[PDB]
Amino acid sequence: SGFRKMAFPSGKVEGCMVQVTCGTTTLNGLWLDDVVYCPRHVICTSEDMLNPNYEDLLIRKSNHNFLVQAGNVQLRVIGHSMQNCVLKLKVDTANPKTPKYKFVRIQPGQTFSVLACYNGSPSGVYQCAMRPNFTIKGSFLNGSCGSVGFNIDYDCVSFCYMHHMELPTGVHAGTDLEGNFYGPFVDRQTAQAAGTDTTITVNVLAWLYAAVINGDRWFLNRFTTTLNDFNLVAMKYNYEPLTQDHVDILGPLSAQTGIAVLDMCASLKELLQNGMNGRTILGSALLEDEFTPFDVVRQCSGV
């Protein structure tokens, strides 16, 4: 029993982390087979941060202008190319620890583990949720670019995030491993704003299930609602719409607890309208939405 923000073990991703340096700019890269993936602005000089001409900066660079270090031993670069906002440095050695892996693009509402790195070395690992406005709420300092986010299924590592940026509001933005930003952001030394954020309704309900399973039950009531009427209350409080697929995905948790999804909706509606009035749920005084149904089942189901 118990519930915590839980990352996937980072061992497989640790074995692919390297540093990449060009001039006085150092950041992290991911070494998979004989390719190192890193953000492309490693090739920028400070004199041209406002709108870098990447195409054109990259042709002026040679393989020897790049320093790649895997655990402080240098990896020789024998070719380089750009794909969207990521740089691909082909090196003379295949990473002997490359895991089975996939590059995937995640949907807002999904979670992944972040391995925060500096100078090619890991600092720590934590979980994040991709928000509806395509930002994440992480812990990243200068030098952390090229840190990756990931999930693990059996033996396969699905890389879904590569870190690039911290917005003026203090949240974080990045790309998939093909160089395409999540959200409308660009890799320029410029202040950019995110869309308005919303709460991930299906995740809040998954968390209420985790609470019930763990003994926290004071918010449950004797009522139910329809999907259409609940969504009217959800819109009113800046919550995402709850879909029929969201109802089916919560089926396992509904089956384990015996509480129907639409009954949990009625309890949430009450929580939205009346607040918590000083009570807590699973140790929190606010309604939490960075746990998916998958995250809850992985931890709370022996069943």
Add this chain to the structure above:
Amino acid sequence: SGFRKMAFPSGKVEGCMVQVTCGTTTLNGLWLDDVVYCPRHVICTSEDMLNPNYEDLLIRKSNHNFLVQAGNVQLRVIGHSMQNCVLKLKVDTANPKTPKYKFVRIQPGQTFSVLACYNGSPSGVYQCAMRPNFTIKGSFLNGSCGSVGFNIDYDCVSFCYMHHMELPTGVHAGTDLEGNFYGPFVDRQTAQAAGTDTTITVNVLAWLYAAVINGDRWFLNRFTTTLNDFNLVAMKYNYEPLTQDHVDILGPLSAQTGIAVLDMCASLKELLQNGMNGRTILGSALLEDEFTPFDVVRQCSGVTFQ
């Protein structure tokens, strides 16, 4: 910027996790050099679960009765001894992925990373605190026994916890890697209660410093207080007393922020007495106590491990 509950990189430890089976019990073990460490109740049958006599159970076991699996590879057991609540099973192969390591026993209020495992397979990693009542509030299901907690101290993996038990209240209890329990607990199938818990004052202050470094400054005030006067209110709200040693440990963060420890002590007592009046700190509407002062320094200074 930003501040999150962050576990240590779990790679060094993943490569040490194995499965141990004896009779009907499968649980996790720790494979370092040529020894596999695991909880001793793996030799137990369900009969006489209320107070097993482990000394006798072990003599009727042999090396061939212990099945150790490291992934697909079976490790031949060539010797076995019991040490407090752990079994030390000598195996015929030394783990080529043993890290630089230490066994240490931690104190209440210190934090560590837990690598939750089931049947030898790592499932997840999270951060936990040794509470003042020698429990941890973990996330453990059946089969998790033998999962370990650890810190990386500069370059050395210091194993400090091996999981054994879940109490009726839902919290968890375990041992050091020498087999001695944290708290007043025993490895027996019985309902056991823990002492009342308290809040770890020094860690809450460390978290207030983390908040400042990250821009939250509203709870700062111009009042002042003494440690004796602070402790008098701390006791009213169930906080551990703040000692001078605790004040010394907040020294580095006081320097980085330019806020003296006792002015932060004044800020915390106002918080306890008056609440946050709808406000939040590092996104939280409650006060956190599972970050040590070094946890704050590690994270806000980008400390790495290699």
